């Protein structure tokens, strides 16, 4: 040859294959063979304990608070309703500028809520306002694509994910993108912050997940394996692992320190996509929302399917476990949220 | 006897089918909130409840009197004929509402989605049930209907209550469904224009099939009874109690067929499938 | 083309020099953190209805 | 204490009654998604509707025709892989597909994009309103005779003007044949595999056209009529 571009493509493939060899080098055993002697969790049949109604359209995002009692929900009717999940009372009902909201977050201090969507803007609302009605306080601009997910770090740091194949860390006060994360080819669809705020991973529509160092802005690890678009992602409660769900009707468990996939959760009677995933407090239960209106509960150690949560008139679009592990909520396109335990 | 046991089993099967179909509609409504969401479903629930009342209240006693030959419940039956008129009028009436309903939701889709709010739905359901109870019980308990227990309606009452309960609803239902036919035929011709342009009576048969099924089951099931109710007390050419009785059963038979013709939307089908399993 | 290739090669070299542990140990750590907290996960071990805010009044 | 329970209960009451008035409002608004290539008229159509009709470039516009509210939205800041933000519009009444009929070489791009929209997995019951926009420019190019359609579509040579054509008063038969040829290329896609679940309604429009509210109104009404028909198995 001679053209440095073909030599970089070649050296690229050489590095990817030395990396694949270094990955198969540490693949001595599988999690299933190791955990074949543990006892199964048994049939887990949780039931609807509450039903939260009010939304006029499909719910697209929800997030529990740190107190494990309140939660915020964003619907594509242009509303963002805050619920006291214990008493089913509504604490706030925030009308939204753009009705196509796709994400909503709950600040760990409980003072602020965030949300964004097809407007390419992340809007922060101060819940502890001092006069009249809760209204907009900040609005983070800069993305050239639709905002798909966002989660607070503290009362001033917030990370956003967008369809421009980038993630960004923002300082809410100054409004500047304090850090930019680039490298994804397709739309970034979901992000999950580690329990210690130091790193975070992101799953994109290029069938890849990437682990990013928040403070340094570099991609530390890239995991692959899904055959199509990644729709959801979340950290293992330990902080060194995460699970992904994709449109190919499969869940995959990756480890951070081992740097490869550990286990795959699928059934040949399950053909629909997957919209949301989340672990329990101990990481033993993995809940995943499928398009077939159901939610499957997998045993994160045996790859066996353990329980089901049926009851919904449309695709379950989101779910989330409380910070105390007491219950899980599910939002679907039938305009209802349901608490389960 | 051979004929008697056959009437018994056929009548028991008819009642069980009525009860099963209508309780299935009512259950598919109560269990699934995505069926209670609309308003046309409100009217379909009203219809199913009326026919379920027909079954449980009115049909079996007449079947027992048909088997045994003598009316054993006695003073009840004063009430029964009143009950009969009510349940058998909340059914025909309800069809009328549902028919106008579909029409109003096809001739003015925007106005419909705006004005038909569940308050108007409840008002229409209220008119049907209250018209039924009024026109049925009040002339019975006041003994205006009288000119084995004689359920023979008075000569003037037959024609009057008949005109209301059937002939106002059949006129309204025929008007509505012929209008819906005009509209569907227009749209079919229009859709056919585009496809012929692209390429350059199956959909008509589908329209005919559905309108014919609805109106033809209703008419061929109820109409003889009401032209009889018309002719008989005036002349009672004339007929006997057994023939009048089979045409009565035709009337209550339509209450059996109503679920399959008015509650087989795809979602209703799937709700039944997840119910029975 | 040429800039994204230099960035892709340096990124792959950066991703290559991470230190990985054996999968047997990574799974042993996952099982240990799981069963070490298994008894405190109400969704796994059901909590009596007295201390359940969603089953009580 | 218990007072705070009654305050929370009346907070729930004020919320739910606000949501009931909002439910009626949301129930009566017909969402219309504006889609289409660039160098088209989407942003000009939204700008014109905000001007000529009472209308709330910007992504959205809210306008009323005959006491019927609409909310038309055009997405501008995205990429070309519309495969994922499209599922936010699976319930819209109709998609307004705008096509630059005067752009003889970007027309194949419009045909391919229309095919991908018409066959989308999440748009199976969504009817498309086809605006063959910029008809005045098309007449300009046809009368000018510098760029002829046969050089880009050799089929146009054997094409015959349909016998059902309804030309407006004062139109050269060459322009009529050209615009009805573009019409039938898109109708051949809409009438292809498609489904009996949804249809395409072509209209020749220009950015200065004023009845471009009556067209969306009429066609939303036909889509709803046919939804109500196919619901009762009539049509
Ligand atoms: N001459 C003419 N120009 C038009 C017409 N419709 C739109 N345009 C042009 O389109 C331009 C607007 O940009 P536009 O393509 O709408 O941005 P987009 O919404 O992203 O596609 C304007 O400068 C108009 O001149 C039309 O009917 N006639
Ligand atoms: N078996 C129904 C008999 C009946 C029902 C309604 C009437 O109005 C009526 O005159 C008679």
Which protein residue has the closest C-alpha to ligand 1 atom 3?
D134
Within 8 A of B34 by CB-CB distance, chain A residues are 313, 334
Q: Nearest residue on chain B to D185, judged by CA atoms?
A: B198
- Angstrom distance (rounded) from CA D169 to CA B267: 49
Inter-residue contact A228 to A235 (CB < 8 Å):
no
Structure tokens given for D230: 């196919």
The sheet that has A285-290: what strands, in order across it? A274-279, A285-290, A294-299, A305-310
SS3 D143: helix
Structure tokens given for A188: 């970034």
Neighbour-count burial for B227-261, b at 16+ CB within 10 Å, e otherwise: ebbbebbeeeeeeeeeebeebbbebbbbbbbbbee
Inter-residue contact A310 to A293 (CB < 8 Å):
yes
Distances (CA, A) of A104 to A64, A161, B209: 10, 12, 50
In this structure, what DSSP letter does residue C46 have?
A: P
Give B213 Cα–ligand 2 centroid separation in angstroms. Answer: 24
DSSP A208-254: -EEEEETTT--EEEEE---SS-EEEEEE-TTSSEEEEEETTTEEEEE
- Angstrom distance (rounded) from CA B175 to CA D157: 51
Is the shortest distance between the CB of B251 and ligand 2 below 6 Å?
A: yes
> Residues 6 or more apart from B89 whose CB is under 8 A from it?
B131, B132, B135, B136, B164, B165
- Angstrom distance (rounded) from CA D235 to CA D225: 10
- CA B21 to chain centroid: 13
In D45-192 the beta strands, taken as DSSP E runs, fall at 60-65, 68-74, 94-100, 127-133
Give me the domain span that covers residue A191. 4-340
Angle at B184 between CA B182 and CA B186, to 5 degrees: 70
Pocket probe for ligand 2: among B165, B167, B253, the residue whose CB has the most ligand atoms within 8 Å is: B165
Within 8 A of D222 by CB-CB distance, chain B residues are 187
Contacting partners of chain A (3+ CB pairs under 8 A): B, C, D
Distances (CA, A) of B165 to A159, B88, B171, D177: 68, 9, 11, 59
Q: Which residues make beta-bridge pairs with A217?
A: none
Interface of B with A in 9-38 (CB under 8 A): 32-34
Inter-residue contact D209 to D134 (CB < 8 Å):
no
Nearest chain A Cα distance for residue C29, angstroms: 9
Inter-residue contact A61 to A102 (CB < 8 Å):
yes
Inter-residue contact A281 to A321 (CB < 8 Å):
yes
Neighbour-count burial for C20-32, b at 16+ CB within 10 Å, e otherwise: beebbebbbbbbe
Inter-residue contact B50 to B92 (CB < 8 Å):
no
| Closest C-alpha to C36, from A324, A281, A45, A297 | A281
**Between β-strands A230-235 and A209-213, what pairing exists: parallel, antiparallel or unpaired?**
unpaired
Nearest chain B Cα distance for residue D21, angstroms: 12
Structure tokens given for A126: 């101060």
SS3 D14: helix
Inter-residue contact A317 to A59 (CB < 8 Å):
yes
- Angstrom distance (rounded) from CA B179 to CA B190: 17
Nearest chain D Cα distance for residue A335, angstroms: 12
The total number of structural domains in chain C stands at 1
Binary contact (B199, D191; C-beta < 8 A): yes
- CA B71 to chain centroid: 26
In this structure, what DSSP letter does residue D157 have?
A: G
SS3 A35: helix
Give me the domain span that covers residue C29. 1-57
Inter-residue contact A116 to A147 (CB < 8 Å):
yes
Which protein residue has the closest C-alpha to ligand 2 atom 1?
B84
- Element at A176 (helix H, strand E): strand A176-181
Distances (CA, A) of B77 to A261, B68, B83, B90: 77, 15, 9, 19
Inter-residue contact D162 to B197 (CB < 8 Å):
yes
Look-up: residue for tokens 């573009």?
D182
Classify residue A123 as exposed, middle or buried by CB count within 10 Å of its CB (0-12, 13-18, 19+).
buried
- Angstrom distance (rounded) from CA A149 to CA A187: 11
What's A331's domain CATH number? 2.130.10.10
Angle at A193 between CA A192 and CA A199, to 5 degrees: 125
- Angstrom distance (rounded) from CA A159 to CA A153: 7
Neighbours of D8 (CB within 10 A): 15
- Angstrom distance (rounded) from CA D199 to CA A20: 50
Neighbours of D45 (CB within 10 A): 24
Cβ of residue A51 closer than 8 Å to a chain B Cβ: no
CATH class of D2-232: alpha beta
Angle at A280 between CA A275 and CA A284, to 5 degrees: 105
Inter-residue contact A123 to A97 (CB < 8 Å):
yes
Inter-residue contact B169 to B92 (CB < 8 Å):
yes
Binary contact (D85, A56; C-beta < 8 A): no
**Between β-strands D127-133 and D94-100, what pairing exists: parallel, antiparallel or unpaired?**
parallel
Give A101 Cα–ligand 1 centroid separation in angstroms. Answer: 28
| Closest C-alpha to B132, from B72, B82, B197, B57 | B82
> Residues 6 or more apart from A149 whose CB is under 8 A from it?
A61, A102, A103, A160, A161, A188, A189, A190, A191
Classify residue D168 as exposed, middle or buried by CB count within 10 Å of its CB (0-12, 13-18, 19+).
exposed
Pocket probe for ligand 2: among B94, B161, B253, the residue whose CB has the most ligand atoms within 8 Å is: B161
Pocket probe for ligand 1: among D35, D44, D76, D137, the residue whose CB has the most ligand atoms within 8 Å is: D44
Give D39 Cα–ligand 1 centroid separation in angstroms. Answer: 6
The span from the first CA to the last CA of chain A, in angstroms, equals: 63
Within 8 A of A101 by CB-CB distance, chain D residues are none
Q: Which residues make beta-bridge pairs with A263?
A: A253
Classify residue B79 as exposed, middle or buried by CB count within 10 Å of its CB (0-12, 13-18, 19+).
middle
Look-up: residue for tokens 């995505």?
B34
Biggest CA–CA distance in chain B, Å, is 75
Give B146 Cα–ligand 2 centroid separation in angstroms. Answer: 13
Is the shortest distance between the CB of B116 and ligand 2 below 6 Å?
A: no
Binary contact (D199, B211; C-beta < 8 A): no
DSSP A9-32: HHHHHHHHHHHHHHHHHS--S-HH
Distances (CA, A) of A47 to A270, A308, A309, A329, B96: 22, 10, 8, 11, 42
- Angstrom distance (rounded) from CA A148 to CA A151: 11
- Angstrom distance (rounded) from CA B145 to CA B155: 8
Look-up: residue for tokens 């630059």?
D100
Inter-residue contact A53 to A331 (CB < 8 Å):
no
Inter-residue contact D15 to A90 (CB < 8 Å):
yes
Cβ of residue A334 closer than 8 Å to a chain B Cβ: yes
Interface of C with A in 1-30 (CB under 8 A): 1-2, 5-6, 8-9, 11-16, 18, 20-24, 26-30
Structure tokens given for D123: 């748009």
Pocket probe for ligand 2: among B83, B85, B223, B232, the residue whose CB has the most ligand atoms within 8 Å is: B85
**Between β-strands A89-95 and A101-106, what pairing exists: parallel, antiparallel or unpaired?**
unpaired
- Element at D87 (helix H, strand E): none
* Ligand 1 pocket residues where CB is under 6 Å: D 38-44, 76, 133-134, 136-137, 206-207
SS3 A320: strand
Angle at B174 between CA B172 and CA B178, to 5 degrees: 120
Structure tokens given for A123: 């809007």
Q: Which experimental method was this entry solved with?
A: cryo-EM
Neighbours of B190 (CB within 10 A): 13
Inter-residue contact A187 to A147 (CB < 8 Å):
no
- Angstrom distance (rounded) from CA D166 to CA D175: 12
Q: Nearest residue on chain A to D9, judged by CA atoms?
A: A89
Is the shortest distance between the CB of B86 and ligand 2 below 6 Å?
A: no
Task: List the alpha helices (DSSP H) in D30-70.
Answer: 42-52
Nearest chain D Cα distance for residue B51, angstroms: 21
Is the shortest distance between the CB of B165 and ligand 2 below 6 Å?
A: yes
Which protein residue has the closest C-alpha to ligand 1 atom 21?
D38
Three-state secondary structure of chain B:
CHHHHHHHHHHHHHHHHHHHHHHHHHHHHHHCHHHHCCCHHHHHHHHHHHHHHHHHHHHHHHHHHHHHCCCCCCCHHHHHHHHHHHHHHHHHHHHHHHHHHHHHHHHCHHHHHHHCCHHHHHHHHHHHHHHHHHHHHHHHHCCCCCCCCCCCCCHHHHHHHHHHHHHHHHHHHHHHHHHHHHHHHHHHHHHHHHHHHHHCCHHHHHHHHHHHHHHHHHHHHHHHHHHHHHHHHHHCCCCCHHHHHHHHHHHHHHHHHHHHHHCCCHHHHHHHHHHHC
Candidates B29, B33, B38, B267, partner chain A, best to mutate (most A CBs within 10 A): B33
Neighbour-count burial for A255-284, b at 16+ CB within 10 Å, e otherwise: bbbbbbbbbebbeeebeebbbbbbbbbbbb
- Angstrom distance (rounded) from CA A234 to CA D174: 61
**Between β-strands D68-74 and D94-100, what pairing exists: parallel, antiparallel or unpaired?**
unpaired
Neighbours of D143 (CB within 10 A): 10
Nearest chain A Cα distance for residue D196, angstroms: 23
């Amino acid at each position: 040859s001679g053209s440095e571009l073909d030599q970089l493509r070649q050296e690229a493939e050489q590095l990817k294959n030395q990396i694949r060899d270094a990955r198969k080098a540490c693949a001595d055993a599988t999690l299933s063979q190791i955990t074949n002697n543990i006892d199964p969790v048994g049939r887990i049949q949780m039931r609807t304990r509450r039903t939260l109604r009010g939304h006029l359209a499909k719910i697209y995002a929800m997030h529990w608070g740190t107190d494990s009692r309140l939660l915020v929900s964003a619907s594509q009717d242009g509303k963002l309703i805050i619920w006291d999940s214990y008493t089913t009372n509504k604490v706030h009902a925030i009308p939204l500028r753009s009705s196509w909201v796709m994400t909503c977050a709950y600040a760990p201090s409980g003072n602020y809520v965030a949300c964004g969507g097809l407007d390419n803007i992340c809007s922060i609302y101060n819940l502890k306002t001092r006069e009249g009605n809760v209204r907009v306080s900040r609005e983070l601009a800069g993305h050239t694509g639709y905002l798909s997910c966002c989660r607070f770090l503290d009362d001033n740091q917030i990370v956003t994910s967008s369809g421009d194949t980038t993630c960004a860390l923002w300082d809410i006060e100054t409004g500047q993108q304090t850090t930019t994360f680039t490298g994804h080819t397709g739309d970034v669809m979901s992000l999950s912050l580690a329990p210690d705020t130091r790193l975070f991973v992101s799953g994109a529509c290029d069938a890849s997940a990437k682990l990013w160092d928040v403070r340094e802005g570099m991609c530390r690890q890239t995991f692959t394996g899904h055959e199509s678009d990644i729709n959801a992602i979340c950290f293992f409660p330990n902080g060194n692992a995460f699970a992904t769900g994709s449109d190919d009707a499969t869940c995959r468990l990756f480890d951070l320190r081992a740097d490869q996939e550990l286990m795959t959760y699928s059934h040949d009677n399950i053909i629909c996509g997957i919209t949301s995933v989340s672990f329990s407090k101990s990481g033993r239960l993995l809940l995943a929302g499928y398009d077939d209106f159901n939610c499957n509960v997998w045993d994160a150690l045996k790859a066996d399917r353990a329980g089901v949560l049926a009851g919904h008139d449309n695709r379950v679009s989101c779910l989330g476990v409380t910070d105390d592990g007491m219950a899980v909520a599910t939002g679907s396109w039938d305009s209802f949220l349901k608490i389960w335990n | 006897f051979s004929v008697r046991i056959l009437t018994a089993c056929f009548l028991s099967l008819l009642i069980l089918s009525t009860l099963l179909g209508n309780t299935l509609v009512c259950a598919a409504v109560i269990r699934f909130r995505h069926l209670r969401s609309k308003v046309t479903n409100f009217f379909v629930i009203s219809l199913a409840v009326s026919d379920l009342l027909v079954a449980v209240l009115v049909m079996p006693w007449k079947a027992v009197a048909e088997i045994a030959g003598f009316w054993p419940f006695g003073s009840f039956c004063n009430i029964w004929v009143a009950f009969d008129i009510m349940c058998s009028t909340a059914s025909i009436l309800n069809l009328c509402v549902i028919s106008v309903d579909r029409y109003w939701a096809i001739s003015s889709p925007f106005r419909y989605e705006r004005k038909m709010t569940p308050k108007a739905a409840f008002i229409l359901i209220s008119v049907a049930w209250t018209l039924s109870v009024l026109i049925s019980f009040i002339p019975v308990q006041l003994s205006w209907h009288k000119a084995n227990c004689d359920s023979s309606l008075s000569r003037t009452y037959a024609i009057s209550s008949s005109v209301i309960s059937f002939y106002i609803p059949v006129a309204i239902m025929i008007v509505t469904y012929t209008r819906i036919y005009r509209i569907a035929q227009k749209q079919i011709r229009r859709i056919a224009a585009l496809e012929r342009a692209a390429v350059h009576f199956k959909r008509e048969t589908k329209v005919l099939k559905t309108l014919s099924v609805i109106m033809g089951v209703f008419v061929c099931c109820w109409l003889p009874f009401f032209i009889l109710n018309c002719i008989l007390p005036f002349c009672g050419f004339c007929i006997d109690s057994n023939t009048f009785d089979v045409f009565v059963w035709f009337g209550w038979a339509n209450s059996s067929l109503n679920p399959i013709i008015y509650a087989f939307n795809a979602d209703f089908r799937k709700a039944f499938s997840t119910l029975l399993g | 083309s040429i800039a994204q290739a230099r960035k892709l090669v340096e990124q792959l070299k950066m991703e290559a020099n991470i230190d990985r542990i054996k999968v047997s140990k990574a799974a042993a750590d996952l099982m240990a953190y799981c069963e070490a907290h298994a008894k405190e996960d109400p969704l796994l071990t059901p909590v009596p209805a007295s201390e359940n805010p969603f089953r009580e009044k | 204490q218990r007072n705070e329970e009654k305050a929370q209960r009346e907070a729930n009451k004020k919320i739910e009654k606000q949501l009931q008035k909002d439910k009626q409002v949301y129930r009566a608004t017909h969402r219309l998604l504006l889609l289409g290539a660039d160098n088209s008229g989407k942003s000009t159509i939204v700008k014109q509707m905000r001007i000529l009709h009472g209308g709330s470039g910007i992504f959205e516009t809210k306008f009323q025709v005959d006491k019927v509210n609409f909310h038309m939205f055009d997405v501008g800041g995205q990429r070309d892989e519309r495969r994922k933000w499209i599922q936010c519009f699976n319930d819209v009444t109709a998609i307004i597909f705008v096509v630059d009929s005067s752009d003889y070489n970007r027309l194949q791009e419009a045909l391919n994009l229309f095919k991908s929209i018409w066959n989308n997995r999440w748009l199976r019951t969504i009817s498309v309103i086809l605006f063959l926009n910029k008809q005045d420019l098309l007449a300009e190019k046809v009368l000018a005779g510098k760029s002829k359609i046969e050089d880009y579509f050799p089929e146009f040579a054997r094409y015959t003007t349909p016998e059902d054509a309804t030309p407006e008063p004062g139109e050269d038969p060459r322009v009529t044949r050209a615009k009805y040829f573009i019409r039938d290329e898109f109708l051949r896609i809409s009438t292809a595999s498609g489904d009996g679940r949804h249809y395409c309604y072509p209209h020749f429009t220009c950015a200065v056209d004023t009845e471009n509210a009556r067209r969306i109104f009429n066609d939303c009404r036909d889509i709803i009529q046919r939804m109500h028909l196919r619901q009762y198995e009539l049509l």
